[PDB]
Symmetry: C2
Subunit: 484 residues, 2 copies
């Protein structure tokens, strides 16, 4: 039925019928968008320097935020832990029972926030969350608990913390506008409503979701060396060592000593805001100039899935202006910024046909543009270049973290819409790693450093970080700066 259920083979992609003038333009696009293996190596050297610089006292464009997880999960932890994952529209409550053999069981609910909460009072927001937590606990522990359930709170809003059981909101985003919260620690605000309702929970950790991706995945997969999100936003987290963090010198208690692990939330979207190494094209420059913050987020702009259609849009417009393509078409829909989302390069890269009929129907239907087959062949080459460049640049952050820490082998626990859904992304990223290291290895499943699907960072990961944190808190081991 249709093409049958199995993944169609890649199209042959003959260029024999493409006229010389378009072939010249395609080869021009290859020089603008191709990232050489040696170029990746060059970017990784700079990236390692900038990781180091973000951990220094002077700091750098990469935040390199300490995540206050100062131990590795062993996979042998047991017990019941909660996670709260607060988004802009919904929250999720997860009960994780850790089985102590790299395994876990989950029970989870999701609650839609009423639309007035976002602009309501502080107390009503924390009240709503505590009400959801009471309803969930009352059901799953109808006879109560012997000890309070430790909870890990994924709060992925700009926030700072001097210890793991704290989060001082810096500024509301994802929609919110509530008074009396910016500049305050949210952990006591949530805990106060929890205690007001006599719910047996202690909020012991506040985290970024990518730190949670790292930790949940290392609990299940002991080869895990990094958590990476490759989607609309981008981020990476990994464990560095305290002796490598100059900006914490003089701030730590003796029980977070120089050889302690320390999870880092890199927030590396701002890598190369100086615009030195990343291969920004005139199209990337336009994107940046037209973005909400020109000059910010350089690495994110170069690797996020959000921009991949817009790159194509601007290139196609440039080709149309130069008189090469769409000569007798009405291209008005193409002039709309972001009209081409990530589905465009994805559907074009997935097209299994030599005549590129999926790509034909996509342009005719969505943009009112008729194409010749050789135009579609240029379009398909361009989509391939854009998806492949994004993968090759994302793996530079992977290779920089691995080389910084001396990981010769690693599983890189990955999540995000580009990793999970972009066509051929896993193949592109594996070939990119192989190109960087020049490995003599036949199959991608045998690569020394390889991306694998992550465990749930904002749910499971927050619950396992709560476990690790409660173990320290109970023993009186520090999980923050001296005195905090």
């Amino acid at each position: 039925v249709r093409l049958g259920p199995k993944k169609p083979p890649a199209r042959k992609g003959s260029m024999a019928d493409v006229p010389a003038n378009l072939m010249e333009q395609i080869h021009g696009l290859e020089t603008l968008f191709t990232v050489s293996s040696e170029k990746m190596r060059s970017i990784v050297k700079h990236f390692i320097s900038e990781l180091d610089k973000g951990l220094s006292k002077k700091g750098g464009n990469i935040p390199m935020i300490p995540g206050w997880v100062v131990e590795y999960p062993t996979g042998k932890e047991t017990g019941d832990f909660l996670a709260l994952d607060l988004g802009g529209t919904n929250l999720r409550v997860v009960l994780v029972k850790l089985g102590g053999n790299h395994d876990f069981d989950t029970t989870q609910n999701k609650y839609r926030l009423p639309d007035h909460l976002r602009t309501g009072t502080s107390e009503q927001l924390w009240s709503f969350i505590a009400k959801c937590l009471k309803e969930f606990v009352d059901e799953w522990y109808p006879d109560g608990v012997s000890e309070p359930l430790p909870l890990g709170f994924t709060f992925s809003y700009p926030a700072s913390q001097k210890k793991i059981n704290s989060g001082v909101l810096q500024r509301w985003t994802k929609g919110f506008d509530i008074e009396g919260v910016e500049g305050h620690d949210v952990v006591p605000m949530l805990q106060e409503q929890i205690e007001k309702l006599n719910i047996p929970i202690n909020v012991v950790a506040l985290i970024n979701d990518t730190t949670g991706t790292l930790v949940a995945s290392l609990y299940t997969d002991p080869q895990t060396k990094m958590g990476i999100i490759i989607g609309t936003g981008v981020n990476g987290a990994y464990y560095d060592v305290v002796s490598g963090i100059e900006k914490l010198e003089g701030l730590l208690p003796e029980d977070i000593g120089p050889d302690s692990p320390m999870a880092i939330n890199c927030e590396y979207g701002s890598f190369d805001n100086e615009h030195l190494v990343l291969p920004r094209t005139k199209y990337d420059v336009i994107i940046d100039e037209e973005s909400p913050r020109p000059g910010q987020q350089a690495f994110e702009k170069m690797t996020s899935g959000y921009y991949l259609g817009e790159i194509m849009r601007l290139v196609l417009l440039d080709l149309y202006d130069s008189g090469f393509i769409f000569k007798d078409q009405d291209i008005s829909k193409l002039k709309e910024a972001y009209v081409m989302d990530t589905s465009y390069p994805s559907k074009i890269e997935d097209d299994p046909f030599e005549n590129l009929e999926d790509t034909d129907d996509l342009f005719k239907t969505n943009l009112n543009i008729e194409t010749t087959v050789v135009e579609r062949k240029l379009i398909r080459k361009l989509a391939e270049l854009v998806g492949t460049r994004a993968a090759r640049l994302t793996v530079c952050g992977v290779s920089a973290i691995c080389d910084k820490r001396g990981y010769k082998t690693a599983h890189i626990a990955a999540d995000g819409s580009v990793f999970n859904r972009y066509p051929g992304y896993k193949e592109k990223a594996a070939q990119a790693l192989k190109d960087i290291y020049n490995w003599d290895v036949e199959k991608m499943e045998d690569h020394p450093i390889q991306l694998v699907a992550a465990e749930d960072g904002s749910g499971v990961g927050a619950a396992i970080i709560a476990c690790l944190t409660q173990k320290r808190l109970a023993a009186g081991k520090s999980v923050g700066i001296k005195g905090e």
Copy 2:
């Protein structure tokens, strides 16, 4: 992010808070929609009697159509062969190179049919298809070929054939309405257009796609015993033996002997149109009575994914009318036939939350109905019952074919949107085979009869049947009834 990239585990699905009166209706639904293994076995006995009846001279509700493939592919076939698949919106052209080691390579194009084709003239249709084939051959064979390319034509319209290289259209479907084709053999009509354009192709076979699914999958997977489609429509194909086909007695040449294999396209959607054996409910009766052809396609109506939402819509409306659910809601959407497509039970079965928030959002957003959590638990149970009943009744068809032919081990090469995408469908069907055979086996890979993904029947399958047929035609071996 979200719930992380891996399939969430199944929800716990506690029924502890469901009031007694609603819990009685839930258990009533479970009794009504569960198909016991004892009932599966009984259905299979009647299904086998009906397969035998369809092959008899007097015939029966199951067509049991001889497919005129009278040999098994060995996997040693080599060479270049074409397939054409004509659907209602497009046609697909496929070049299949057979490697001689159960292996093949494909090169394919897809041509969208001009708007006017479906209602234009026969000449317009066959001339369009020939033009597409000319453009395709002229490209992949620019210096021509040393022998004409044999072509398999997947023409999945009601048609009769007295030999494989023929198809006399009975009735257009899929929106076609072309004068001067019904009651005529379409093979010479296509061949004439190919010859007018001097394209080096011989149309050697016309097939139903399910016959293609059987043969392509047996070429690649020597354990294949059946091809099965579980989608919007349902069908199954397998090899019987000529001595087992009474309705061909007296009609065959000596070289299609009593021991020859014969592929059968069952068209078993009409099994039990008498409505005596399948466990219909009043809801299935309403679906049949309200359908375009009441009393037809009984087995299709009980196993196709097309009706799974509509079964739920009717059950839910019945429970509302009875006063049990949605009291005080505006249920007018529930009153629209086919408002609930297959995505409803699919999304509901995938909902990972104990409070069924995905199901809550689906009902509010799409149906304008607010639910209590206990209503959603009834809705979820109903979706599981409906998907599970469909899987177990499809497995009765599989088990009837295996038991008819004495297959105690088999790969069942499966395709269609239900098999490929319906949540948990592969585990539902594997459990159903274990139940009917009462196998003492823990792991699915140890199951002696298993559904596996099919190879492409309408492309690769048609091309492989062209290959088998060409070898016979060249040698003078028959592929049809005497004299045809």
